[PDB]
Write a protein that holds these residues in place. Structure first.
Motif, PDB file in Angstrom:
ATOM      1  N   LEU A   1       6.615  -8.546   6.982  1.00  0.00           N
ATOM      2  CA  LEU A   1       5.633  -8.655   5.908  1.00  0.00           C
ATOM      3  C   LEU A   1       5.898  -7.615   4.829  1.00  0.00           C
ATOM      4  O   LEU A   1       5.749  -7.895   3.634  1.00  0.00           O
ATOM      5  CB  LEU A   1       4.215  -8.534   6.468  1.00  0.00           C
ATOM      6  N   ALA A   2       6.286  -6.403   5.233  1.00  0.00           N
ATOM      7  CA  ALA A   2       6.588  -5.362   4.256  1.00  0.00           C
ATOM      8  C   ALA A   2       7.816  -5.730   3.432  1.00  0.00           C
ATOM      9  O   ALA A   2       7.875  -5.442   2.232  1.00  0.00           O
ATOM     10  CB  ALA A   2       6.792  -4.022   4.962  1.00  0.00           C
TER      11      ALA A   2
ATOM     12  N   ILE B   1       6.754  -8.476   0.854  1.00  0.00           N
ATOM     13  CA  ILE B   1       5.892  -7.912  -0.181  1.00  0.00           C
ATOM     14  C   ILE B   1       6.711  -7.089  -1.163  1.00  0.00           C
ATOM     15  O   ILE B   1       6.410  -7.053  -2.363  1.00  0.00           O
ATOM     16  CB  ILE B   1       4.763  -7.076   0.453  1.00  0.00           C
TER      17      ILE B   1
ATOM     18  N   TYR C   1       4.854   4.119   3.098  1.00  0.00           N
ATOM     19  CA  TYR C   1       3.700   3.598   2.378  1.00  0.00           C
ATOM     20  C   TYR C   1       3.696   2.075   2.378  1.00  0.00           C
ATOM     21  O   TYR C   1       2.626   1.455   2.413  1.00  0.00           O
ATOM     22  CB  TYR C   1       3.712   4.143   0.947  1.00  0.00           C
ATOM     23  N   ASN C   2       4.878   1.454   2.350  1.00  0.00           N
ATOM     24  CA  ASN C   2       4.945  -0.001   2.423  1.00  0.00           C
ATOM     25  C   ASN C   2       4.647  -0.505   3.830  1.00  0.00           C
ATOM     26  O   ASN C   2       4.079  -1.591   3.989  1.00  0.00           O
ATOM     27  CB  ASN C   2       6.319  -0.488   1.964  1.00  0.00           C
TER      28      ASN C   2
ATOM     29  N   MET D   1       0.582   0.274   4.432  1.00  0.00           N
ATOM     30  CA  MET D   1      -0.249  -0.715   3.752  1.00  0.00           C
ATOM     31  C   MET D   1      -0.134  -2.075   4.423  1.00  0.00           C
ATOM     32  O   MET D   1      -1.121  -2.816   4.517  1.00  0.00           O
ATOM     33  CB  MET D   1       0.138  -0.807   2.275  1.00  0.00           C
ATOM     34  N   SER D   2       1.062  -2.419   4.903  1.00  0.00           N
ATOM     35  CA  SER D   2       1.221  -3.653   5.665  1.00  0.00           C
ATOM     36  C   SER D   2       0.457  -3.585   6.981  1.00  0.00           C
ATOM     37  O   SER D   2      -0.207  -4.553   7.371  1.00  0.00           O
ATOM     38  CB  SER D   2       2.703  -3.933   5.914  1.00  0.00           C
TER      39      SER D   2
ATOM     40  N   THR E   1      -3.233  -3.945   6.375  1.00  0.00           N
ATOM     41  CA  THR E   1      -3.614  -5.320   6.064  1.00  0.00           C
ATOM     42  C   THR E   1      -3.852  -6.123   7.338  1.00  0.00           C
ATOM     43  O   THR E   1      -4.860  -6.831   7.461  1.00  0.00           O
ATOM     44  CB  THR E   1      -2.537  -5.981   5.203  1.00  0.00           C
TER      45      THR E   1
ATOM     46  N   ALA F   1      -7.823  -4.459  -0.588  1.00  0.00           N
ATOM     47  CA  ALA F   1      -6.565  -3.783  -0.889  1.00  0.00           C
ATOM     48  C   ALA F   1      -6.720  -2.822  -2.057  1.00  0.00           C
ATOM     49  O   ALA F   1      -6.051  -1.783  -2.103  1.00  0.00           O
ATOM     50  CB  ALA F   1      -5.471  -4.810  -1.184  1.00  0.00           C
ATOM     51  N   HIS F   2      -7.589  -3.154  -3.014  1.00  0.00           N
ATOM     52  CA  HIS F   2      -7.868  -2.234  -4.111  1.00  0.00           C
ATOM     53  C   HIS F   2      -8.528  -0.960  -3.595  1.00  0.00           C
ATOM     54  O   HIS F   2      -8.232   0.141  -4.074  1.00  0.00           O
ATOM     55  CB  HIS F   2      -8.750  -2.919  -5.156  1.00  0.00           C
TER      56      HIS F   2
ATOM     57  N   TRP G   1      -6.079   1.291  -1.526  1.00  0.00           N
ATOM     58  CA  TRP G   1      -5.248   2.004  -2.491  1.00  0.00           C
ATOM     59  C   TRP G   1      -6.027   3.077  -3.240  1.00  0.00           C
ATOM     60  O   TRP G   1      -5.510   4.177  -3.467  1.00  0.00           O
ATOM     61  CB  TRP G   1      -4.626   1.019  -3.476  1.00  0.00           C
TER      62      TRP G   1
ATOM     63  N   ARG H   1      -6.429   2.150 -13.695  1.00  0.00           N
ATOM     64  CA  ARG H   1      -6.913   1.130 -12.776  1.00  0.00           C
ATOM     65  C   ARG H   1      -7.785   1.689 -11.660  1.00  0.00           C
ATOM     66  O   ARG H   1      -8.238   0.920 -10.805  1.00  0.00           O
ATOM     67  CB  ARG H   1      -5.731   0.362 -12.178  1.00  0.00           C
TER      68      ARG H   1
ATOM     69  N   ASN I   1      -3.685  -9.006  -7.221  1.00  0.00           N
ATOM     70  CA  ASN I   1      -3.956  -8.685  -5.824  1.00  0.00           C
ATOM     71  C   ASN I   1      -4.164  -9.950  -5.004  1.00  0.00           C
ATOM     72  O   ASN I   1      -3.696 -10.044  -3.863  1.00  0.00           O
ATOM     73  CB  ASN I   1      -5.182  -7.777  -5.714  1.00  0.00           C
TER      74      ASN I   1
HETATM   75  O1  LIG Z   1      -2.257  -0.336  -9.695  1.00  0.00           O
HETATM   76  C1  LIG Z   1      -2.556  -0.779  -8.639  1.00  0.00           C
HETATM   77  C2  LIG Z   1      -1.747  -0.720  -7.466  1.00  0.00           C
HETATM   78  N1  LIG Z   1      -2.287  -1.304  -6.333  1.00  0.00           N
HETATM   79  N2  LIG Z   1      -1.713  -1.401  -5.026  1.00  0.00           N
HETATM   80  C3  LIG Z   1      -0.547  -0.538  -4.893  1.00  0.00           C
HETATM   81  C4  LIG Z   1      -0.163  -0.380  -3.449  1.00  0.00           C
HETATM   82  C5  LIG Z   1       1.101   0.355  -3.378  1.00  0.00           C
HETATM   83  C6  LIG Z   1       1.740  -0.141  -2.201  1.00  0.00           C
HETATM   84  C7  LIG Z   1       1.129  -1.474  -1.910  1.00  0.00           C
HETATM   85  C8  LIG Z   1       1.222  -2.435  -0.726  1.00  0.00           C
HETATM   86  C9  LIG Z   1       0.271  -3.408  -0.548  1.00  0.00           C
HETATM   87  C10 LIG Z   1       0.326  -4.291   0.505  1.00  0.00           C
HETATM   88  C11 LIG Z   1       1.378  -4.183   1.399  1.00  0.00           C
HETATM   89  N3  LIG Z   1       1.453  -5.101   2.504  1.00  0.00           N
HETATM   90  O2  LIG Z   1       0.511  -5.688   2.852  1.00  0.00           O
HETATM   91  O3  LIG Z   1       2.471  -5.254   3.051  1.00  0.00           O
HETATM   92  C12 LIG Z   1       2.352  -3.194   1.223  1.00  0.00           C
HETATM   93  C13 LIG Z   1       2.265  -2.318   0.152  1.00  0.00           C
HETATM   94  O4  LIG Z   1       0.011  -1.666  -2.825  1.00  0.00           O
HETATM   95  C14 LIG Z   1      -3.629  -1.811  -6.763  1.00  0.00           C
HETATM   96  O5  LIG Z   1      -4.411  -2.369  -6.090  1.00  0.00           O
HETATM   97  N4  LIG Z   1      -3.790  -1.460  -8.263  1.00  0.00           N
END
Ligand SMILES: O=C1CN(/N=C/c2ccc(-c3ccc([N+](=O)[O-])cc3)o2)C(=O)N1
Ligand SMILES: Nc1ncnc2c1ncn2[C@@H]1O[C@H](COP(=O)(O)OP(=O)(O)CP(=O)(O)O)[C@@H](O)[C@H]1O
Length: 206
Positions: free
Chosen positions: A24-25, A28, A70-71, A74-75, A78, A142-143, A146, A170, A185
């Motif tokens: 998944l990472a 993405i 970080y990738n 976040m994965s 999720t 996810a917002h 982050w 943001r 998103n």
């Molecule tokens: O400016 C911005 C930025 N941002 N999200 C940024 C982040 C940075 C890394 C990832 C990320 C998300 C999901 C997954 N995944 O699920 O694999 C892996 C990495 O998102 C937001 O919401 N507004």
């Protein structure tokens, strides 16, 4: 402004889901690399935001460790978020990973690092309405995941972004956010759920 997402502490990730967490990472990141080239960017080793050069526009295996974790985190968060909502992730279709081809882009998408974005060809994957409400709900979360991590690093709101102070325009509630980012998103997590289904996973609440 307080970004409080769904609590992911009372949740663990079973070792049999680590496989998708890794794939998944990758997908993405592949989607990110494509969208970045699609908007003025290229490969570079010394990042200069004005020159549109980026070091992270490389294959998932060549990423540096700081950006890589970080990738993966976040994965992992999720997946844990779905579990905290009462939904399950389970493999049913064993041949889907073999019937999962990857998207091949024009020749101009190849850069000076040998990397050319190749996300999975998940265009023929249809989602049920209940999975759409999930992706929309997952997007707002996810917002917050982050925004919370950024806030504890000192990131606040600032009319102009900046890679040397904790500024970002943001860092605002999901309601006061431009619909372009809100839609971005939703699209990202729509492929996230399609990534599960593309590997043969059924999303289903308890
Ligand atoms: O400016 C911005 C930025 N941002 N999200 C940024 C982040 C940075 C890394 C990832 C990320 C998300 C999901 C997954 N995944 O699920 O694999 C892996 C990495 O998102 C937001 O919401 N507004
Ligand atoms: N909105 C998002 N959704 C999923 N992954 C994201 C993401 N934003 C960044 N990433 C991941 O973060 C990694 C690179 O980190 P980086 O700090 O360079 O983000 P960035 O340069 O895109 C800030 P911005 O997008 O605001 O210009 C990338 O490999 C990418 O996979």
């Amino acid at each position: 402004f307080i970004p409080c997402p769904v609590d992911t502490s009372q949740v663990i990730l079973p070792p049999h889901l680590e496989k998708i967490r890794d794939r998944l990472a990758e997908n993405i990141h592949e989607l990110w690399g494509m969208n970045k080239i699609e908007l003025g960017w290229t490969f570079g080793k010394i990042r200069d935001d004005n020159k549109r050069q980026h070091p992270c526009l490389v294959e998932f295996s060549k990423l540096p460790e700081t950006e890589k974790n970080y990738n993966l985190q976040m994965s992992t968060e999720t997946l844990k978020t779905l579990l905290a909502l009462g939904c399950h992730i389970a493999h049913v279709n064993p041949a889907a990973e073999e019937d999962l081809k990857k998207v091949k882009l024009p020749k101009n998408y190849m850069m000076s690092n040998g990397y050319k974005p190749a996300p999975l060809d998940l265009s023929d994957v249809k989602l049920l309405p209940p999975q759409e409400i999930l992706v929309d709900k997952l997007a707002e979360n996810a917002h917050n995941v982050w925004a919370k991590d950024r806030i504890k690093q000192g990131w606040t709101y600032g009319i102009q972004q900046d890679l040397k102070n904790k500024r970002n325009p943001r860092l605002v509630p999901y309601a006061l956010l431009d619909e372009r980012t809100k839609k971005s998103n939703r699209d990202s997590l729509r492929e996230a759920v399609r990534t599960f289904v593309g590997y043969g996973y059924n999303i289903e609440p308890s």
